[PDB]
Amino acid sequence: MKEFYLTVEQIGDSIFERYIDSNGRERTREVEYKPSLFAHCPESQATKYFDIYGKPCTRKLFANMRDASQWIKRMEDIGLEALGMDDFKLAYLSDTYNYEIKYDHTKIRVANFDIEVTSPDGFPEPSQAKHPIDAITHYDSIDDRFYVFDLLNSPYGNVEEWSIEIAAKLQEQGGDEVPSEIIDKIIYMPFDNEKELLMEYLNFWQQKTPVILTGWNVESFAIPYVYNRIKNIFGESTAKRLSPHRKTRVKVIENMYGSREIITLFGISVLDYIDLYKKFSFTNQPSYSLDYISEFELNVGKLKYDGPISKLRESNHQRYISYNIIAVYRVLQIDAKRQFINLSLDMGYYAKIQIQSVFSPIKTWDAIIFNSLKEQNKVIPQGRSHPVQPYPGAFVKEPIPNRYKYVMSFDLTSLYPSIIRQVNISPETIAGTFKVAPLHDYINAVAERPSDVYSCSPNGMMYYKDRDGVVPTEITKVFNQRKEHKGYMLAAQRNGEIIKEALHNPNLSVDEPLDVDYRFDFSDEIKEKIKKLSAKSLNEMLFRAQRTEVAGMTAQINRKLLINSLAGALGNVWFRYYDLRNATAITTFGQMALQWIERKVNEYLNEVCGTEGEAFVLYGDTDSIYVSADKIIDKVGESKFRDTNHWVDFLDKFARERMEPAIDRGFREMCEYMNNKQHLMFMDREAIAGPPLGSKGIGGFWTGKKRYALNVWDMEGTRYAEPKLKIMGLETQKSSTPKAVQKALKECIRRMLQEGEESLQEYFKEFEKEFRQLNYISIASVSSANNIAKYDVGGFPGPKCPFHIRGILTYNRAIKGNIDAPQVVEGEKVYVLPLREGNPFGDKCIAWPSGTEITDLIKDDVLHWMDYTVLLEKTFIKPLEGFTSAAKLDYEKKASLFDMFDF
DNA sequence: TCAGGTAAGCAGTCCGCG
DNA sequence: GCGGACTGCTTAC
Ligand SMILES: Nc1ncnc2c1ncn2[C@H]1C[C@H](O)[C@@H](COP(=O)(O)OP(=O)(O)OP(=O)(O)O)O1
Ligand SMILES: [Ca+2]
Ligand SMILES: [Ca+2]
Ligand SMILES: [Ca+2]
Ligand SMILES: [Ca+2]
Ligand SMILES: [Ca+2]
């Protein structure tokens, strides 16, 4: 097999590389890497190497990396460009793997672990590590085994051995319900003392050295705790045995609360699962506890125990150990669904970077482009300092707040990347400039044609159309991958709706789920076989389909993120190819395109509907338009349709057969105007929206920019079994909105759109009466807690202190002394509740860490003093007032003269 | 060794307001 | 008690 790296590191004048050799063996090597950089030279003659602008460069081969760094400094002091790849390990990887890396994941050691540390005096701070590690579960992906290290003897208690027979039993039978499919995979190892545990753990780590280290919050807890604990007992160089190159970096950041540590383990690639989750999940969660995310992702119940965790080991060591193991397995289960580690490996190896750099699209794209240009023997430019400058982005149309009955939307595919490809925007393809003119003049096709020679953006820039650029070339490759995965995603989605329709008529039989590839639309014969299946097998098939759809989602949305990040990176001062000319060429062209097609769509629909000056496009954001279809429906009559599906088929046909060609004509004209290299503005129908036929629902409404709701029947070719709410921007979509309020506002919205005003009043009435009965956690608001120190005096509110920060400070006073109370972590989310005037807490609100119950010592007072009236008014009524007044609806009955008609 | 982007809504603080 | 000028946070793209 072809070799591939595992990790790369630069230590001195040495590169340290772990790799997989041609026999599939893991090896490590130290290489005295001799790097090259470049300098502009005469011309004039005979070089071979050219910078991206075509200017000749001479190659400087250095005896070591130190010398090449020093030479870089001298060139700066002289005032001359030092060209070439200055991150030498990227250069090393590029030289050593000069071919497309095909990797074998079964040879890459991916380690999942977590530790337990009993602490009788508050959170065990890793930077201190003054309490014993009493449990480690470490899952190795090569062995497919959970290695459990369990401390029996501790200054905080002596316990008996953990029992695997008890662990396996149902919780209802006194066991721990450790999943059956991992019971045979546990290798349990008890210890009579912590030193022997830690020694054995380090020895184990030498034999089975992680390449990818992950887990839940391992970067901020597990890793620094283990490092500092070992350092405190054995000395630092023993703790350095966690690095295979025996090299670590300890970054501090201190006070005032206050002091944490991130340990860098050279020769390892840490990918904390919380960081993967945050970057790649496209959720915003009110909490990032593992219980919370596990529930969300897997529908598993929280790991229940009695008493504080500080006492769990001594009261129920059996459960303590089992939960340590289960928490490790849960991260694996989430990864099985989400596939972020796969994504990371795919991305790292494609780009030729350290795997942990997949977090940085700038590092990722510097490597991709570097590698692309090196193949053509071109020399990359030096990175320069730039001052940060604000610049213009997208256009958002101001909508008339109203109800909108029948709505069709249309969207440009992968817009910013498509603009880069269409215009040919790249650092080395800049042709020149032209005299601009106001954007409005281009939108209305009245401005002078920018050029008849070069490809243009309305920001003033001209690009060559016969050369091709590194950015369009490399962005097209990732884009093409994205659309493939999006196709798998959508097919799995459509196939999912086929199973759901079939679930209306399950057969009374005993059978098996079909063996099919959910990435491809079902064939007629698979569809027939499905009509004969039992519910149990259909439900199994739906779950597999949905998993296929999630997998596709991860693959496609994150490739989308990578290419969109290339367009933004052009506007970041640390990007080697930073250039506001290019960044604004994308955003300004985008602004023109949306408004251009608004005009063209208004022009087309006025023609076909025999009218003039009527506004069909009711709204647009960045690359999308929303078209009122009321008049289209009216021209035929609601009379008249057989059912809901009938008018949806009609709008679908009208969008596909009439509107899309008119749109395509509009954009081809715009491509001609801008004299672009390639037409790539592909605007396809997205959603079909409206009420159920013969109901009183309003179909949709807008309240303002980025705030609307639609009752959607078809979405990108997926015809739903049951209509789905597309809600954007509203409080239902925000993580700061209390759980039960999200749920209540959604049902309020559902009733408005599908059922009508009357139904809405019914529900509101009930929710208002029942509000005070809801659990306090479900009605708490959530907020991130940044910049706490700034506003602390303390421990009282400073000037302009935000509400949520005020509540934290109130919490911090209420939990002085007694240490069973968990502390608020800077940058993390908190629950927030208003308090009634005169409360014993001495302020208008309180806040505590989200995902958790408020400590039992103050919980009773919070519950007694919670201001329900203010809660309901702030979180539910005020938002609902916004929705209903926009939609010309009332959530409770108004006037009226009729009032006096029951006696 | 640290670094995709901008547009834009709403909650809240401070202040003005016989 | 509720507006405008700010900060903070959060979402849509
Ligand atoms: N996370 C982001 N980072 C940077 N730019 C973004 C991001 N999301 C959206 N944009 C910008 C670039 C996009 O091309 C443009 C339109 O957004 P959007 O419609 O969500 O995706 P898209 O048009 O790129 O892909 P799709 O094919 O899924 O429609 O807005
Ligand atoms: Ca734990
Ligand atoms: Ca789009
Ligand atoms: Ca689309
Ligand atoms: Ca059937
Ligand atoms: Ca869009």
For the record, the structure tokens of A828 come out as 């993390």
User: To what resolution in angstroms was this structure determined?
Assistant: 2.3
Find the helix or strand (DSSP H, E) in which A607 lies: helix A580-608
What is the C-alpha separation between A171 and A177, in angstroms, rounded?
6
CA angle A758, A763, A764 (to 5 degrees): 95
> Whose CA is closest to A226, among A247, A245, A255, A205?
A205
Residue A518: C-alpha distances to residues A483, A499, A622, A714, A721 (Å)? 16, 11, 33, 20, 18
The nucleotides of chain C lying under 7 Å from a protein CB are 7-13
Q: For nucleotide C11, give the residue with the nearest CA to its C1'.
A: A729
Select from A280, A281, A409, A415 the residue to mutate for testing ligand 1; criterion: most ligand atoms less than 8 Å from CB: A415
> Whose CA is closest to A811, among A800, A413, A667, A825?
A825
| Residue with CA nearest ligand 1 atom 21 | A414
Determine contact, residues A249/A263, Cβ cutoff 8 Å. Answer: yes
The pairing of strands A707-715 and A683-689 is antiparallel
Looking at the CA of residue A557, tell me the nearest atom of ligand 1.
Answer: 28
Determine contact, residues A863/A854, Cβ cutoff 8 Å. Answer: no
Place of tokens 């243009």: A456
DSSP state letters, A843-891: SSEEEEETTS---HHHHHHHHHHB-HHHHIIIIIIHHHHHHHHHTT--S
Determine contact, residues A243/A268, Cβ cutoff 8 Å. Answer: yes
What is the C-alpha separation between A669 and A673, in angstroms, rounded?
6
What is the C-alpha separation between A462 and A61, in angstroms, rounded?
37
Determine contact, residues A687/A434, Cβ cutoff 8 Å. Answer: no
Cross-strand partners of A26: A20
Residue A624 Cα to ligand 3 midpoint, Å, equals: 7
Residue A718 Cα to ligand 5 midpoint, Å, equals: 22
A892 three-class SS:
coil
Residue A411 Cα to ligand 3 midpoint, Å, equals: 5
Say how many C-beta atoms besides its own lie within 10 A of residue A357's C-beta. 20
Place of tokens 């202190």: A801
Helices (H) and strands (E) in chain A, counts: 29, 31
A832 lines ligand 1 (CB under 6 A): no
What is the C-alpha separation between A700 and A408, in angstroms, rounded?
11
- Can you say how many angstroms the Cα of residue A707 is from the centroid of all Cα atoms in its chain? 21
Say how many C-beta atoms besides its own lie within 10 A of residue A131's C-beta. 19
Determine contact, residues A434/A456, Cβ cutoff 8 Å. Answer: yes
Alpha helices, H only, A184-255: 194-207, 222-234, 236-239
What is the C-alpha separation between A725 and A242, in angstroms, rounded?
50
For the record, the structure tokens of A725 come out as 């709410």
Determine contact, residues A781/A736, Cβ cutoff 8 Å. Answer: yes
What is the C-alpha separation between A612 and A590, in angstroms, rounded?
27
What is the C-alpha separation between A744 and A382, in angstroms, rounded?
55
What is the C-alpha separation between A745 and A741, in angstroms, rounded?
6
The nucleotide closest to A736 (CA, C1' atoms): C10
Residue type present at position A174: G
The nucleotide closest to A800 (CA, C1' atoms): B13
Q: Check residue A254 and report its DSSP letter.
A: B
Looking at the CA of residue A568, tell me the nearest atom of ligand 1.
Answer: 4
Q: What is the largest CA-CA distance in chain A?
A: 106
C1' (B1) to CA (A264) span, angstroms? 11
Select from A365, A416, A565, A621 the residue to mutate for testing ligand 1; criterion: most ligand atoms less than 8 Å from CB: A416
Say how many C-beta atoms besides its own lie within 10 A of residue A258's C-beta. 9
A695 lines ligand 1 (CB under 6 A): no
| Residue with CA nearest ligand 1 atom 25 | A414
Determine contact, residues A708/A619, Cβ cutoff 8 Å. Answer: yes
The nucleotide closest to A388 (CA, C1' atoms): B3
> Whose CA is closest to A43, among A61, A30, A32, A57?
A57
Place of tokens 């105007």: A673
Determine contact, residues A667/A681, Cβ cutoff 8 Å. Answer: yes
Determine contact, residues A713/A420, Cβ cutoff 8 Å. Answer: no
What is the C-alpha separation between A83 and A382, in angstroms, rounded?
5
All domains of chain A, ordered by start, with CATH? 1-108+340-382 (3.30.342.10), 109-339 (3.30.420.10), 383-468+573-729 (3.90.1600.10), 469-572 (1.10.287.690), 730-774+867-888 (1.20.1280.300), 775-866 (3.40.1820.10)
Residue type present at position A142: I
* Terminal-residue alpha carbon distance, chain A: 91
C1' (B8) to CA (A706) span, angstroms? 8
A700 three-class SS:
strand
Determine contact, residues A213/A269, Cβ cutoff 8 Å. Answer: yes
What is the C-alpha separation between A236 and A231, in angstroms, rounded?
4
For the record, the structure tokens of A672 come out as 């001609």
Determine contact, residues A711/A691, Cβ cutoff 8 Å. Answer: yes
Q: For nucleotide C6, give the residue with the nearest CA to its C1'.
A: A800
Q: What experiment produced this structure? A: X-ray
Residue A841: C-alpha distances to residues A340, A387, A776, A836 (Å)? 44, 47, 17, 10
